[PDB]
Each structure stands twice: as C-alpha cells, then as structure tokens.
Design a protein around this ligand. Structure first.
Ligand SMILES: O=c1cc(O)n([C@@H]2O[C@H](COP(=O)(O)O)[C@@H](O)[C@H]2O)c(=O)[nH]1
Ligand SMILES: O=c1cc(O)n([C@@H]2O[C@H](COP(=O)(O)O)[C@@H](O)[C@H]2O)c(=O)[nH]1
Lengths: 219, 219
C-alpha cells in the first residue's frame, strides 16, 4: 500500500491487556493468524513481569510495541526506555504532554539501541478533552520538530483525525486506538491511520478469532 | 495527620536489587517512606515492593505516573495495590475520568492516590504548567487529598497549596540534584522527595543526615 513503510498484517494491532499470562498467551495464539503486531502494556507487564515481552516475541515471532505511556522527567524516561528495549520491545509509546526534553530523552535511547519511539499526541477517552485535546496540535508539531515519525492518535471525527495527519504528514506512521469497545469504526479510522489498535472487542470476545476476522472483514 | 519521618521521602531509582536494598538500608534511620518507580520495578520486578515493605517496615509510594484511559488505569492500580503499594502517583493531565478510575480502585483496596499536578523539569513549562492550576482544582473537585508538585519558586508552590488547602498532603520532588532547596520547599510541602543527592552519594547516610540537619528547625 505504501512503498516507504510496510503495513502491519491486516493493519490491525492487538492491544493485549489481559493480566494473566495463560489467558494472554492463549488469546494471542488464537488471533496470530490475523495479527502480527501486539501492543503490550502495564496491565500485563506489571502482572507477569518484563520477561513476557521476550516470551511473546519468541513464541509468536511478532512485533511488540511497549505501551508504557512514558511520562516522567528526562532522566527517568531514559532509564525506562533502556529497560524496555533491553526486554526486547521493538517500540515504546511516549507521552508528548510532559514536553520536548522528556521526549528527546526517549529518542536518544531509541537511537542508541536501534529501536523506535511512538509519540502519543491526543487520546480517545472523554477525559482527554479536558487538557490533552487543547494541546494536541502543538504536541504533534513538537513531534515533527523533534523528527518523530511514529505517532499514536485516536479514532475520532474525520475533521479531527485529518488535522493530525495534516500536521505529521503522509510519510509519518500513525496507529489509532479507540476502535470497537470505545466506539471507533475500523474502516473510517483507516482512512487516516496506518493501523488500528483493538483490545477488548477481541480479547473479551467469546471467540477472539471470530472477532478479529470479523473486524478485518468489515474492511 | 502524622508527618512522614523527618519529612523526607527517598526516591529509590537505582536499577540493581542489592544496590537499591543497600542504600535504602543505609538511610532507613532517617527515612521511613520510600518512592519506588519504574526504573526499579521494570528492572527487578513488582516483588521488590513487598520486599522493601517487609525488610524496612516503610510505606511505599508507587511512582507510576499513571496516564492512560480509565479502564487501563484501573488495571494498573489493581496490580500495584496487589503488590503491596500503600499509594500510587497518577497524572492529572489525562483528565478527571482517568483519575476517578484510580480513586475507585484505591477505595476498593484501602489504599491512597497522589495526584501529580505540575512537574519539575524544563519541559514541564511547555504544556503542564499552563494546566497545573486547573489540574489541582480538578483534584479538589474529585476529593483528592494527596498531591505532588515541584520544588520551585515560592509563588508556584504557594499557589498549589492555596488551591488544595491546608488539610491536603503535598510532597515535592526536584530537591537536590535538580536544584531545589529542602527548607524553602518544606515551607509549602509536607515532605520533600530526594533521589540522586542521596543514592548517588559516596556516603548516602551522610547525605541524608546533612539534608535533615539543614531542616532541623522545621521538624
Ligand atoms: O488514546 C488512547 C491511547 C491508548 O494507548 N489507548 C490504549 O489502547 C487500548 C484500547 O483498548 P480497547 O480496544 O479495549 O479500548 C488500551 O490498551 C488503551 O490503554 C487508548 O485506548 N486510547
Ligand atoms: O515533577 C517531578 C515528578 C516526579 O515524580 N519526579 C521524580 O522524582 C524523583 C527525583 O529524583 P532526583 O532527586 O534524583 O531528581 C525521580 O524519581 C523523578 O522521576 C521528578 O523528578 N519531578
């Protein structure tokens, strides 16, 4: 679809937020036919340890995005990124709201370890309207100023998601949560995002495989 | 409320278990409250929290800067309280629903939430500073009683204290390595948080002793 970057399989990323290793491995195995890129966050890591990342990579041969919403001072951010890449994460998700130096600290580690940073510029939940939404454009422009090429932005009104894409450019890579459980539509979101992120609609389904196939079908 | 011992909280951001245990053991005489963050937890595991509580009989504040959607926030809080943390630090920038999610888990498990309203690093001026007063007011609206604000100009910390009232509990990082003065900060904060000035000291006990000496009249 793009010649400059390869799409994740089916342009669909699994948000694996189950907090039990057995369950997380089973459900992931059940949709691996459909998905080759898994987002692992604190719910799973704080429950089962950082070793889970390497276990996923070995068992499933998938890409791993560590969704750690990094949001500390530069010095602490560097330590978090280092531990995370040491654990085998292909990329880490970093909040933009704490400012440019905090983001730069993560970018520096990513450069040293040959990994990637995704910048979170805007969020999907209702609370996001209070403070994040007002800063979102400026956070995205900050990302561009810093040379960030990978972004996280939410499924939203076309006029909104289009604005993000306008800022970051067509050459940037954009992944988008808020699809399914939170009300976002997979197809509409993929008009602007390179990939959609889906958690509960898949991992809480009676039949995870059917949910995944069903989503892919709807597009 | 009872003061934290000597109004001094150790930021234990070493990433080796024996070094972390050693330094903490060396200053335990002076400090009975320890802030444990992702640098330590992501390197040594969540079990380090219960180990500290057992070995040192200290209260543990989990500095996880929780900054996700409500549903993910709830999972992170649950895992953290299950690991034995007495309190968790939550970002206010993501809005009221994300904070309420943490408050709800804290209520269910008999633990506490600290709201992070403003930060100490230069990047904090970009987006956080402009929202800090309103994040603090949101905290008041939600019934938050515990806050984190940075060691800074009396004006800044005074304004935060004004908003949260005299009854609220306020702790403040940015003391020592980042240039903050222990005595001036304790003018408004109930306790100061100190990391590198202690844990990177040739003599941590001596470093801790010196800080306390310098604030003798305020204890
Ligand atoms: O703005 C955002 C940013 C996120 O990372 N997320 C994350 O994306 C995932 C959404 O999962 P779900 O499809 O179950 O709503 C969760 O892991 C959540 O933490 C989000 O929902 N909204
Ligand atoms: O505004 C803030 C909020 C923090 O939690 N922190 C945290 O407080 C500690 C400061 O440690 P130090 O005294 O070495 O600067 C670190 O754990 C950092 O992540 C901070 O420095 N500034």
């Amino acid at each position: 679809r793009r010649v400059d970057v390869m799409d994740v399989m089916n342009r669909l990323i699994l948000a694996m937020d189950l907090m039990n290793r057995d369950d997380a491995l089973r459900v992931t195995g059940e949709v691996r036919e459909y998905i080759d890129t898994v987002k692992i966050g604190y719910p799973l890591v704080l429950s089962e340890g950082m070793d889970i990342i390497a276990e996923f990579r070995k068992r499933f041969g998938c890409r791993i995005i560590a969704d750690f919403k990094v949001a500390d001072i530069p010095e602490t951010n560097e330590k978090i990124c280092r531990a995370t890449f040491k654990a085998g994460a292909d990329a880490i998700i970093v909040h933009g709201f704490p400012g440019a130096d905090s983001v730069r600290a993560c970018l520096n580690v990513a450069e040293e370890m040959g990994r990637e940073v995704f910048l979170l510029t805007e969020m999907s939940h209702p609370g996001a309207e209070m403070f994040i939404q007002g800063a979102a454009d400026e956070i995205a422009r900050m990302g561009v100023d810093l040379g960030v090429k990978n972004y996280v932005g939410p499924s939203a009104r076309p006029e909104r998601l289009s604005r993000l894409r306008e800022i970051i450019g067509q050459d940037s890579f954009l992944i988008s949560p808020g699809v399914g459980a939170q009300g976002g539509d997979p197809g509409e979101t993929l008009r602007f995002a390179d990939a959609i992120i889906v958690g509960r609609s898949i991992y809480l389904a009676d039949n995870p495989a059917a949910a995944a196939a069903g989503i892919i079908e709807s597009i």
